[PDB]
Amino acid sequence: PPVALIKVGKGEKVLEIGHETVLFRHDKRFEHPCGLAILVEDTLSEGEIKERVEKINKLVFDRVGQMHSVNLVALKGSSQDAATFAKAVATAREVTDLPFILIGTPEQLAAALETEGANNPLLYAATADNYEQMVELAKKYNVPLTVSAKGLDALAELVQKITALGYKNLILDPQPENISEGLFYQTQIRRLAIKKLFRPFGYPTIAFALDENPYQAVMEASVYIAKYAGIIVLNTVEPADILPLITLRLNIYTDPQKPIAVEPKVYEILNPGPDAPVFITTNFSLTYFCVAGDVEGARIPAYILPVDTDGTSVLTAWAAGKFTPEKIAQFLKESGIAEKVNHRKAILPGGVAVLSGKLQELSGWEILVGPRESSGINSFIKQ
Amino acid sequence: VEVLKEKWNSKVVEVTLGTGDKTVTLGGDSTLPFLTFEGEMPNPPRFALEVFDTPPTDWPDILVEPFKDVINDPVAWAKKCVEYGADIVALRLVSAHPDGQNRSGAELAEVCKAVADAIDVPLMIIGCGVEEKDAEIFPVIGEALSGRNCLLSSATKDNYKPIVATCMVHGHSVVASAPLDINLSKQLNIMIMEMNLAPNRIIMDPLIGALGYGIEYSYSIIERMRLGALTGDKILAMPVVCFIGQEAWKAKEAKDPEVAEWGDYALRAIHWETVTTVALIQAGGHLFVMRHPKSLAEVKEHLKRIL
Ligand code: B12
Numbered sequence: 272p273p274v275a276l277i278k279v280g281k282g283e284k285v286l287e288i289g290h291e292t293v294l295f296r297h298d299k300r301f302e303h304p305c306g307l308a309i310l311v312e313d314t315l316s317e318g319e320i321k322e323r324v325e326k327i328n329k330l331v332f333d334r335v336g337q338m339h340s341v342n343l344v345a346l347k348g349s350s351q352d353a354a355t356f357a358k359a360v361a362t363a364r365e366v367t368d369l370p371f372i373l374i375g376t377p378e379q380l381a382a383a384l385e386t387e388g389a390n391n392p393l394l395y396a397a398t399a400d401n402y403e404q405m406v407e408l409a410k411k412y413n414v415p416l417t418v419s420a421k422g423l424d425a426l427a428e429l430v431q432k433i434t435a436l437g438y439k440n441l442i443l444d445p446q447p448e449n450i451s452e453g454l455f456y457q458t459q460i461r462r463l464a465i466k467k468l469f470r471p472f473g474y475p476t477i478a479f480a481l482d483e484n485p486y487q488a489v490m491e492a493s494v495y496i497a498k499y500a501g502i503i504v505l506n507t508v509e510p511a512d513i514l515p516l517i518t519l520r521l522n523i524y525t526d527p528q529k530p531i532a533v534e535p536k537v538y539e540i541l542n543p544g545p546d547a548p549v550f551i552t553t554n555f556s557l558t559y560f561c562v563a564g565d566v567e568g569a570r571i572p573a574y575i576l577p578v579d580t581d582g583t584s585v586l587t588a589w590a591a592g593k594f595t596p597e598k599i600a601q602f603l604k605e606s607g608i609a610e611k612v613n614h615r616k617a618i619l620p621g622g623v624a625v626l627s628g629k630l631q632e633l634s635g636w637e638i639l640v641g642p643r644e645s646s647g648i649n650s651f652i653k654q
Numbered sequence: 655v656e657v658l659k660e661k662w663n664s665k666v667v668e669v670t671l672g673t674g675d676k677t678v679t680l681g682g683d684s685t686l687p688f689l690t691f692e693g694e695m696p697n698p699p700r701f702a703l704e705v706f707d708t709p710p711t712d713w714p715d716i717l718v719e720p721f722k723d724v725i726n727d728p729v730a731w732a733k734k735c736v737e738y739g740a741d742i743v744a745l746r747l748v749s750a751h752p753d754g755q756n757r758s759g760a761e762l763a764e765v766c767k768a769v770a771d772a773i774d775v776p777l778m779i780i781g782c783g784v785e786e787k788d789a790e791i792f793p794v795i796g797e798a799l800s801g802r803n804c805l806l807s808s809a810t811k812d813n814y815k816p817i818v819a820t821c822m823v824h825g826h827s828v829v830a831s832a833p834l835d836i837n838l839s840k841q842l843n844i845m846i847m848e849m850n851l852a853p854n855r856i857i858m859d860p861l862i863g864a865l866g867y868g869i870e871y872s873y874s875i876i877e878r879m880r881l882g883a884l885t886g887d888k889i890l891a892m893p894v895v896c897f898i899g900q901e902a903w904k905a906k907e908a909k910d911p912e913v914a915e916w917g918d919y920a921l922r923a924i925h926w927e928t929v930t931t932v933a934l935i936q937a938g939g940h941l942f943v944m945r946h947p948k949s950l951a952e953v954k955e956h957l958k959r960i961l
């Protein structure tokens with residue numbers, strides 16, 4: 272295969288990257304979502320390392336009904352000291368289950384690997400002048416190894432030297448000085464791997480988005496997500512900076528051939544009684560959790576009926592004749608929601624307010640037209 | 655191995671907006687975004703900021719702030735957009751809505767002219783969205799601004815004739831909108847070109863979704879449009895416009911300042927617009943209609959870096 276599959280970490284906190292085969296998702300689909308790593312310097316105090324990793328653990332977000340988050344902690348041996356580095360990784364390890372990327376000299380990684388090796392970390396930096404010592408450590412622990420060099424030529428040659436030494440569990444770093452170079456490198460690595468079966472480049476890459484201007488780091492990371500990075504490293508623990516990246520990865524890595532839908536049945540928010548409101552919506556997962564999120568968020572126990580529109584949003588199914596009065600009425604009977612409530616009222620997305628009258632006669636339910644955005648549901652239920 | 659360089663059959667046409675010294679060129683790409691080692695990128699993406707002909711009423715405080723002193727004055731608001739760096743100013747004729755102010759083409763045309771005369775950059779005029787209303791106002795608008803090569807936004811499959819007719823008679827360019835579908839964008843283009851408007855006076859609007867709310871479909875549609883131009887499909891060889899602002903600022907992540915689970919509101923609201931933009935710049939879009947000046951400035955700095 273074009274790009275080797277490489278795993279960092281283990282046991283379901285494991286990150287699997289590689290085994291990509293296209294340059295454009297519409298050609299097939301991108302297969303393995305890139306990991307996002309956050310940087311932690313070993314010069315921080317014990318207290319500081321823990322506080323930081325704890326913030327890293329909080330970079331988790333619910334998106335379309337699933338928890339998604341950053342996946343690696345990149346510990347950097349800025350101290351230059353192996354004892355300091357080893358102790359810092361042990362400290363970070365006490366506070367998280369995320370796999371690590373160990374950035375440091377050979378002596379720092381070796382002290383650290385005595386305890387961290389078991390956790391299958393990614394070693395950072397087999398370079399032109401240390402690659403021999405790094406390959407030896409990587410082999411002893413059979414851990415993935417980043418091969419780092421400036422440019423495609425140097426990179427490919429180092430990779431050949433390392434693979435000549437018998438190790439192929441690799442990640443690639445072509446060292447771009449800016450995102451112009453980054454895009455270029457990522458694109459070529461991916462093209463040569465897939466279009467030319469170029470072996471030295473048949474591995475996932477790692478990219479860095481460390482800019483202190485957070486708008487810039489986010490944009491640089493966004494480009495890397497869209498453009499083939501296998502692992503991207505940032506240095507921000509601000510949830511606002513990671514949220515859009517997690518969303519972008521979710522979006523870019525979604526299979527284009529089919530939308531993700533939720534199973535069309537009634538969903539209960541919190542623990543609804545026969546008195547709770549009934550919300551009509553579609554089974555497009557994005558749409559349904561927009562609604563579920565708003566309702567649960569306002570702490571409103573309720574029933575949600577995601578009409579099967581083949582996983583299409585409300586205006587999408589509507590325009591495609593798949594969200595008609597007839598179809599919704601049939602789901603009202605189909606879903607078994609009647610057995611659930613003492614009233615006979617249902618709430619329609621405000622965007623299809625027009626369907627009300629026809630849906631009402633026909634289904635025999637009192638149709639209330641809700642806000643156009645699920646965000647106004649709390650205020651609609653209050654009133 | 656050697657740097658793999660694609661030998662692309664064709665290119666996206668170059669569209670020119672504005673006239674005289676206030677001209678702006680878009681398109682012209684004979685390669686994928688930024689891959690100039692195998693093709694040309696005559697023009698960098700261009701950006702516009704929106705100005706409403708009537709004050710926005712549902713805008714978050716953070717988006718009103720950069721225009722708070724000019725929000726009730728279309729002309730002043732437009733000069734401010736230029737001051738904020740916009741390549742193009744995009745006037746949205748919200749008051750034309752038949753369910754709202756339902757203003758006439760004559761009324762609306764005086765404001766488009768006022769705005770147009772006041773700025774040193776080309777003008778993009780977006781309608782109210784109701785095809786029937788738009789087809790009525792654009793011929794009047796295009797007439798008043800005759801010869802100023804503005805960008806009239808939105809000819810659709812059900813309403814293009816009056817608008818394409820106005821562009822041709824009065825020397826304007828047009829935006830062709832079709833819902834995220836290559837064959838529909840193609841059919842529309844064909845029908846426009848059948849009236850003899852040249853492909854270099856047309857910009858395609860795939861009607862995108864912002865980040866988290868349909869951006870992947872938008873991204874892939876735009877990539878197929880760029881690949882279509884490059885490989886020779888003359889019907890896809892037109893530049894692409896993305897209404898970034900309009901969509902990103904509708905996202906909850908950018909509108910609800912009260913959601914502790916998502917971190918600093920100010921940052922995520924801006925990243926919501928900048929990431930939809932950079933992602934669509936990576937997909938192949940050419941003209942980006944933004945709303946917030948900070949998003950615009952950062953993207954422009956990002957562009958300096960990637961170019
Ligand atoms: C992504 C997208 C697609 C994707 C599909 C995504 C999907 N899985 O549904 C694809 C490309 C396949 C698609 C196809 C089409 N699309 Co489309 N699509 C979009 C786009 C860009 C985003 C849709 C989206 O994901 N929205 C986000 C979710 C969350 O929206 P939402 O379900 O409405 O739910 C929100 C609200 O309604 C409300 N709400 C929801 N449930 C409830 C319940 C209650 C009780 C309450 C109170 C509120 C509420 O709260 C939610 C959150 O704010 C939109 C519109 C846009 N950017 O503005 C166009 C859009 C929906 N599409 C449109 C159209 C017409 C189509 C097509 C019919 C076009 C065609 N080819 O003919 C096709 C469908 C047929 C087909 N497939 O052949 C139109 C529909 C409006 C219209 N009819 O004029 C739009 C608006 C584009 C436009 N014309 O400007 N589309």
Ligand code: SF4
Pocket residue numbers: none
């Ligand atoms: S023939 Fe192939 S594996 Fe053998 S020394 Fe040459 S390059 Fe290496």
